Amino acid sequence: QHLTVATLEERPFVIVEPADPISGTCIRDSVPCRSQRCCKGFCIDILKRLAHTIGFSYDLYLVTNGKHGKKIDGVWNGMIGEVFYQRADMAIGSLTINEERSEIVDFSVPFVETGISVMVARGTTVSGLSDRKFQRPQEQYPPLKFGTVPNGSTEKNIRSNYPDMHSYMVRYNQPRVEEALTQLKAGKLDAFIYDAAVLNYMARKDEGCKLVTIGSGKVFATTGYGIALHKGSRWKRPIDLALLQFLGDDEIEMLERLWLSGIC
């Protein structure tokens, strides 16, 4: 009846703000979340609906041990680690389903479609991730500068499928999306390769609409965000049924409009 839920800030899917200074409570659509503050956003609204529909209470906390999830020398960190090591009953956020993670935790059915996209300044001109500027990176006279934020499903995918390109990207690793966008707009990066759902949102919200996304096309695989649960969790089925209901009730579509819209 009571679940411990791990999450991670990644706007606009999870947004963290201080409590209302006047009341000292989380107001509006926000809910209390502690650190491993008030949380809101697309995924938090999903969590609120799951809790109401299925009928559980929860304790929400922000992950400080890494981010989404990476395995290093046999040990998982991030949201995936919290679930795998059974510190949390579930993790919800902008958490990407991939093969490696699916082996060790169960995922809900996907509730947001994602993958990998490439962001560049509208001025800049490359074809896409197929472009040899990316693929044969150290062939270009002034090298192309492209990076990702390391440790997530994007870097995992690139290292596994395009190890040459990955090796070239390492020096351009960015600490978070905000800095990457800054470097891209300053021309310190030529492209930023990252989660599609997030990148496409950032493109839509860009002050002045100067940042644009290119589809990765055939280069990378589509996937989705899923809620992570203990392998064999009894919670998977009721979570899935609820999510499926939300999808067909246009509740998810409504939340997309609410949280992920932009003018660009």
Ligand X SMILES: N[C@H](CCC(=O)O)C(=O)O
207-246 positions binding ligand X, by CB under 6 A: none
Comparison of 50 and 105: residue with beta carbon closer to ligand X: 105
Q: Are 89 and 215 in contact, with CB atoms under 8 Å apart? A: no
User: Can residue 94 be called a binding residue for ligand X (CB under 6 A)?
Assistant: yes
Interface stretch with ligand X, choices 31-39, 148-156, 209-217, 229-237 (CB under 6 A): 148-156
Residue 115 contacts ligand X per CB under 6 A: no
Question: Is residue 53 annotated as involved in ligand binding?
Answer: no
Q: CB of residue 64 vs ligand X: minimum separation in angstroms?
A: 16
**C-beta atoms surrounding 142 within 10 Å:** 6
The verdict on 95 binding ligand X (CB under 6 A) reads yes
153 binds ligand X (CB under 6 A): yes
C-alpha R_g of the chain? 19
Overall size of the chain counted in residues = 264
The H or E element that residue 224 is part of is strand 223-225
Please report whether residue 96 would count as binding ligand X according to CB under 6 A: yes
Point out which residues pair with 195 in neighbouring strands: 116
| Residue 195 in the binding site for ligand X (CB under 6 A) | yes
Task: Provide, rounded to whole angstroms, the least separation between the CB of residue 147 and ligand X.
Answer: 11
25 is in an annotated binding site: no
* Sequence-ordered list of residues with C-beta below 8 angstroms from that of 89, at least 6 positions apart, any chain: 3, 4, 5, 83, 229, 230, 233, 235
- 194 binds ligand X, rule: CB under 6 A: yes
Asked if 117 touches ligand X (CB under 6 A), the answer is: no
Name the amino acid, one letter, at 132.
R
Applying CB under 6 A, the site for ligand X has a residue count of: 12
Q: Which CB sits closer to ligand X, 7 or 26? A: 7
How many angstroms separate the CA atoms of 168 and 254, rounded? 40
Q: Are 17 and 30 in contact (CB under 8 A)?
A: yes
User: Any known ligand binding at 96?
Assistant: yes
* Ligand-binding site membership of 148 (annotated): no
- Residue 131 burial class via C-beta count within 10 angstroms: exposed 0-12, middle 13-18, buried 19 and up: middle
Nearer to ligand X, 56 or 179 (CB): 179
Q: Which of 196, 197, 198, 132 is nearest to 168 (CA)?
A: 132
Could you tell me the smallest distance in angstroms from the CB atom of residue 177 to ligand X?
9
Helix axes 251-260, 236-248, angle to 10 degrees: 80
102 assigned binding-site residue: no
- Residue list for the binding site for L-glutamate: 94, 96, 101, 153-154, 195
| Contact footprint for ligand X (CB under 6 A) | 68, 94-96, 148-149, 152-155, 194-195
